[PDB]
Design a binder for this molecule. Structure first.
Ligand SMILES: [Fe+3]
Ligand SMILES: [Fe+3]
Lengths: 329, 195, 195, 329
């Protein structure tokens, strides 16, 4: 079977066609980074305008590249929640327009659920497993017992990792995207200055990162700062992940979200899996950032279980992953 | 020529069918439901199917921006995939053109906390402005929904003015001279304020 | 106050719901189906139930007499059995009162082979007349459906003018001063010609 | 069970409530004779106006006299056809308004079917039987094999009996209603002049009456004329009825319609049943003219067989009885 997937939850317009026998049939994305860059962040209204403008041209490219007919699609997958509600409604409108037009079922997907299943595109993972989701406004640990069955283990008490990278780069004056810039300054760092790891109490699976912008101000080459910040963040992520495996007894770890593309993060987690002997799944970088293929995969999982949405299904800015799975599976 | 014309500018959502140069169908509903709760379920309830139409029309406002983006996206998707023409239309222009009061005509509509208005003379017109209390010369034109808001020297209030009906008649005229319609990729709500 | 307002004057059958002094619902359909094929099945399709309303309004024309008799009989039956007020309204009066052209106003509508019209001045009005070609002083007012028929010195044609919406707003105003409405046993279509 | 019945097929507005255990619960009629009298006949448009005006006051009287609540009605019976279409739609509109309002089934009745079943109100009749229907525009013989199963045997090739009475009275100058006036002049007739009986061929079950206004002009007291006309008409009706019993072998005869109230007709048919030994059923005079009780009875018969009409059922000026029975039973 095959699905057209729609993702407009934040600042990327993503459409994809996925076939569970033939694989990727089409995949198109357009980022809005350039337009938000001057504002130092994602501007909600402007993002909504961009989705509205870009979604039809992207679709036209997707149809010309894939050569697929919409009559041959078995169901429309789309991100219902969470995200910017002004952007979410654009993709939902587009998905529901096609579904009604072509008389195809609608299958909703939670965005973080999409990130979990982005690794299944390359390799299926046995249940149960742990998921560290590190992207956007999220730095969460989940125990995934089955599709639709996600137990929340811990999350950030202040800044997510992505927001920490942005706040650090802006702190020492740098481009807005923050991430790439620090990963490149950090590659040039010589000395490793010590920084304090916030929570770090025995068995605590929550995260705190804003207590680093304080010790950072108590300071030297900007390269050593980027290098030292990046090392402390990745170490916090790993230790919390290790504690979660010991607390649960589960030795399969999925690491997903945009920060999972960080080349230093991948080194440290791969090394730890080699030293500790646990299974690690990180997606190809093209799948770490928002895309609709991961939405398509989770949509397949939900459709195959017989779950479709009614025509009047409405997006919401923030249904928790655990609750969404119970509602929709 | 059978046109499906849609208006999602306000909480009074409405759509019309235009055939033989006239309104043959109009459905108008004032609802507190969210735009995506109503669409496309309301079409299924009224047996309205996009493949049955030769062309589409849609309001680009002024109106509430999220509900405009939603309606425009429905219609662009249908028009593009079916290879059918699409015509955008503007609410304040229709209000001025269809109201036989003397010039100058000041159509206005309220969206959230802003009162948007536009000034029409016989042979020129202004940009869409934001009302700040100014004394205005001429005849205000609005809807009964906004009867508590006074612009101009006199005011006329339409008991009802379903933009999708007037927009569909306009689109019918438009397609006689421009059968290809407007560029589907370029249809966007009117934005008055910056992001 | 929730009013169900019905218009069966023409082949564009339409009904409205009036609440909080405004149209909250309007359904308008131009159909070649017979009036009793459409009623009451169209109400069932739109989940319109007479027990849900505080009051009823109905057009008494001018319009096609059989379809007027049918609509008036539906509404009188509901209003009488439920003990709810009912208000009749007149199409040509609404067309004159709601169109802001100067006096004299000459609203007109065509029914079969007759063009019925009425003359409105600021403080008086004529009987409903049958047009015979006479030159008339003032502003003709009609519907786009009848655009090929010219009365008066100038003509204004409404793209659309759903009488049930205007009649329902009028009934809402009427019931503020006369909460008991009009005598249900006396509601009859307007007859211009003899039997 | 019980029904509210609606009859507006010609120039009488008739509403009734009938209960198949308790009998007549209400019965109200208003004739339009006075209003049509100046025109020498029923004017269709004027009749439609009168139904519209009179149906609500009649209903109000019916509800006050019967004391029944509409919630206690099991179904609405109404005349769908035949008749004046401008009058038919008024009663149908009224019936469908109540049915939709009160969520009650609709059960259509053919007007002549109502006339057949007007005798069942007083006495059930075994099938098969013959029906002579003599009213309005009809002078027909039918073989009724069951409810809904009516075989047309013969009808008038020109004037019906009612129209003949009207044309005769107008011919010699008299009031429009024609019937009552001739039945009263005829009671005063001394001499019986011979008149020619039209069809009267062996085994022919059709009727012709207009060939009498010719021999009438070849003429004496107006009382002897009324008397002679009335005798010839009734004799034609009886002989045709007798031939129908011999051709079919069926010796039960129902005589219905307005002309069945004629006191001379009743004498001659009752006498013939006494002399020939066939069963004769003629209704009480109050049931010979249009009423809604007979509509209620036939509506009971059709409802009990599971037949209801859809909400969009539409009246028609003239569906033949035989075809109506097949369609609706
Ligand atoms: Fe994401
Ligand atoms: Fe009869």
């Amino acid at each position: 079977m095959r699905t057209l997937a729609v993702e407009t939850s934040c600042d990327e317009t993503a459409l994809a066609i996925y076939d569970d026998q033939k694989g990727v049939l089409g995949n198109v994305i357009l980022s809005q980074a350039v337009v938000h860059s001057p504002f130092g962040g994602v501007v909600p209204e402007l993002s909504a305008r961009e989705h509205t403008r870009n979604i039809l041209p992207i679709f036209d490219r997707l149809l010309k590249e894939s050569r697929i007919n919409l009559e041959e699609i078995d169901f429309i997958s789309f991100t219902l929640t969470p995200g910017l509600i002004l952007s979410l409604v654009v993709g939902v409108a587009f998905a529901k327009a096609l579904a009604y037009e072509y008389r195809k079922p609608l299958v909703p997907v939670h965005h973080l659920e999409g990130h979990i299943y982005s690794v299944f595109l390359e390799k299926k993972v046995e249940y149960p497993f742990l998921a560290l989701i590190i992207s956007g406004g999220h730095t969460d640990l989940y125990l995934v017992r089955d599709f639709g069955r996600y137990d929340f283990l811990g999350g950030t008490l202040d800044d997510a990792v992505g927001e920490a990278y942005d706040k650090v780069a802006k702190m020492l004056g740098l481009g807005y995207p923050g991430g790439p810039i620090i990963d490149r300054l950090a590659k040039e760092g010589k000395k490793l200055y010590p920084l304090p790891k916030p929570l770090m109490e025995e068995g605590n699976l929550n995260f705190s990162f804003s207590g680093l912008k304080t010790a950072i101000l108590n300071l030297v080459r900007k390269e050593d700062i980027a290098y030292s910040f990046q090392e402390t963040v990745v170490e916090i992520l790993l230790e919390k992940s290790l504690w979660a495996m010991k607390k649960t007894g589960i030795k399969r770890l999925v690491v997903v979200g945009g920060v999972s593309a960080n080349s230093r993060l991948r080194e440290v987690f791969k090394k730890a899996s080699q030293e500790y002997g646990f299974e690690l799944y990180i997606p190809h970088p093209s799948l770490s950032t928002d895309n609709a293929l991961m939405i398509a995969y989770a949509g397949m999982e939900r459709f195959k279980r017989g779950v479709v949405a009614p025509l009047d299904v409405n997006p919401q800015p923030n249904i928790p992953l655990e609750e969404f799975g119970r509602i929709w599976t | 020529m059978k046109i499906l014309s849609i208006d999602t500018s306000f909480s009074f959502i409405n759509f019309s069918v235009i055939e033989e140069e006239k309104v043959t169908f109009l459905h108008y509903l004032k609802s507190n439901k969210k735009t995506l709760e109503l669409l496309p379920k309301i079409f299924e309830e009224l047996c309205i199917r996009p493949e049955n139409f030769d062309a589409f029309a849609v309001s680009v406002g002024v109106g509430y921006l999220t509900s405009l983006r939603i309606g425009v996206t429905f219609v662009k998707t249908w028009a593009y995939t079916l290879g059918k023409p699409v015509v955008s239309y503007k609410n304040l222009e229709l209000l001025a053109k269809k109201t036989p009061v003397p010039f100058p005509k000041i159509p206005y509509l309220k969206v959230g906390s802003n009162v948007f208005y536009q000034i029409f003379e016989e042979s020129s017109s202004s940009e869409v402005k934001v009302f700040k209390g100014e004394e205005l010369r001429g005849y205000g034109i609005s809807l009964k929904e906004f009867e508590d808001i006074k612009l101009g020297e006199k005011q006329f209030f339409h008991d009802i003015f379903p933009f999708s009906a007037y927009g569909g008649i306009y689109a019918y005229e438009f397609l006689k001279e421009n059968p290809e319609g407007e560029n589907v990729f370029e249809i966007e709500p009117i934005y008055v304020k910056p992001p």
